[PDB]
Amino acid sequence: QVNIKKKEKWGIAHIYSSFNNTIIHITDITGAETISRWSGGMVVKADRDEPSPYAAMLAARRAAE
RNA sequence: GGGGCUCGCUGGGGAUACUGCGGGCCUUGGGACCGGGAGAGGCCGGGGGUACCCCCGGGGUAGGGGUGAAAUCCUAUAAUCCCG
């Protein structure tokens, strides 16, 4: 780590929004580094719940840690 | 005895509105010109950006695709995704 002056980091979060699935994907402000990728069909077992809001909160909570 | 008759013909005289023809004359129609003017009219040359796809490098893992459910099919020499 080369000295940080601000002591705050920022991560732009791309949100790709389908009626077949939801994808949440937060990267660094450049976009050149992928911390974490989590979708709505690892959370669940079935295709119907692949989208919805409830996958699209839980997917966006695992990343967030 | 009187009339009409397909009734498609002819000769002579007469009228001159209309029509024909001939001549003359005029701008209401038409055409024509000049100047201002809008438009996804046509053609030609020039040039920019969107998004989709594709290909290459990096980053990043367990999926994705698809449906009412599914399967065939995409992806593990790495897909989707994100960055260049």
Side-chain angles (χ1 to χ4, degrees), chain A residues 5-25:
Chain A
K5 206 82 173 161
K6 201 203 304 170
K7 285 287 189 286
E8 155 203 331
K9 285 84 207 313
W10 218 277
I12 61 160
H14 289 289
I15 307 188
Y16 232 89
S17 160
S18 334
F19 302 93
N20 286 251
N21 188 359
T22 309
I23 305 164
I24 283 93
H25 192 284

Side-chain angles (χ1 to χ4, degrees), chain A residues 24-28 33-38 62-65:
Chain A
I24 283 93
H25 192 284
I26 183 167
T27 21
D28 63 311
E33 176 200 79
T34 313
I35 172 70
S36 279
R37 180 295 317 191
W38 267 270
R62 308 133 171 288
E65 305 289 312

